[PDB]
Amino acid sequence: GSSGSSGASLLARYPPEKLFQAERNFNAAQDLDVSLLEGDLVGVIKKKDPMGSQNRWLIDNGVTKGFVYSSFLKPYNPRRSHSDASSGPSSG
């Protein structure tokens, strides 16, 4: 839920050294892949895969876990005023 927030949360959720944005509109190719948005941001999770390839890394689209090629991703840079966080209380 809430894509924007997530994307903004990704900054807090994940570190800057693992903050990568979508270069272009990624189209899920495999079952391990997941549709993304060139405007959507992701946070590198694993720089490997259950096969043996550094080309495909595991990222989180603030929704699920998908596999994409760093090529499609880009090394973000929240440096210079570019960070935001948020929280959520509990209820009954």
Side-chain angles (χ1 to χ4, degrees):
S2 223
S3 311
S5 256
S6 267
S9 316
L10 285 166
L11 294 132
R13 250 197 186 191
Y14 294 91
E17 65 216 41
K18 310 189 182 121
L19 260 178
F20 284 82
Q21 211 170 21
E23 288 256 288
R24 52 169 151 288
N25 256 243
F26 181 102
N27 214 108
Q30 35 181 322
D31 202 351
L32 298 181
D33 284 5
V34 315
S35 54
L36 281 181
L37 284 192
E38 56 176 49
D40 267 11
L41 189 99
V42 306
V44 159
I45 291 167
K46 241 63 132 276
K47 292 183 166 150
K48 254 254 275 260
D49 47 349
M51 268 231 170
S53 270
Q54 52 130 100
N55 245 85
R56 199 162 86 274
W57 287 352
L58 181 71
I59 66 70
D60 222 292
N61 61 332
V63 174
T64 182
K65 299 183 136 131
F67 281 83
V68 294
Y69 308 121
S70 47
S71 194
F72 274 107
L73 296 174
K74 57 109 104 213
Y76 193 64
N77 265 82
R79 218 270 212 72
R80 205 236 74 170
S81 266
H82 259 167
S83 214
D84 310 293
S86 258
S87 219
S90 257
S91 63

